Amino acid sequence: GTSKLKYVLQDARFFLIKSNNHENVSLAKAKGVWSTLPVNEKKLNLAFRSARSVILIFSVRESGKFQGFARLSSESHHGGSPIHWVLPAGMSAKMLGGVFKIDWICRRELPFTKSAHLTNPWNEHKPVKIGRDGQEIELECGTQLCLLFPPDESIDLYQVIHKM
Numbered sequence: 001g002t003s004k005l006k007y008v009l010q011d012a013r014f015f016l017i018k019s020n021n022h023e024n025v026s027l028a029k030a031k032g033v034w035s036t037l038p039v040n041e042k043k044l045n046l047a048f049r050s051a052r053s054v055i056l057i058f059s060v061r062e063s064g065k066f067q068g069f070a071r072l073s074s075e076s077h078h079g080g081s082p083i084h085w086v087l088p089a090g091m092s093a094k095m096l097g098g099v100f101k102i103d104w105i106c107r108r109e110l111p112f113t114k115s116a117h118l119t120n121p122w123n124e125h126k127p128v129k130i131g132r133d134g135q136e137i138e139l140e141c142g143t144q145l146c147l148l149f150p151p152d153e154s155i156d157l158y159q160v161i162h163k164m
């Protein structure tokens with residue numbers, strides 16, 4: 001069902017994560033971690049303290065799709081087990097240094113064609129697929145976007161709920 005999902009998304013905040021490659025999203029799915037540039041790192045740390053759930057919605061550049069969504073379970077932390085991110089051009093490991101822990105809610109894809117009816121008030125009401133890495137998605141748009149993803153029956157939201 002979708003009832004526990006709706007509960008997790010209640011009063012949540014939503015951010016679009018744009019990854020330059022599939023490898024880092026796969027690593028994030030395997031390890032439950034994400035790192036972003038310092039500007040977005042600061043925003044996400046602020047958001048984590050402000051809301052019951054902060055949801056990252058992932059999209060790989062040029063894929064035409066979202067690859068799933070996850071809930072922040074921590075603020076960023078430095079000095080843990082290093083993450084072997086594939087670094088884009090001009091990108092260094094220092095600027096990906098803070099690691100957030102995340103719990104995946106959905107690891108399934110959603111093509112942009114299915115979200116064409118959703119616009120984001122915080123990005124000039126452009127289609128929600130449009131946005132730079134870190135763009136915040138307004139509550140109603142973000143909730144409806146997450147509800148469009150195919151259910152991920154491999155995930156049990158019970159433990160996620162027991163962290164809010």
Ligand SMILES: CNc1nc(Cl)nc2c1ncn2CC1CCCCC1
Pocket residue numbers: 018019020021024034035036037085086087088091096133
């Ligand atoms: C593990 N984190 C990331 N991995 C990858 Cl491949 N791309 C990312 C990541 N965070 C943001 N982006 C997109 C930006 C776009 C501007 C230039 C630098 C990259």
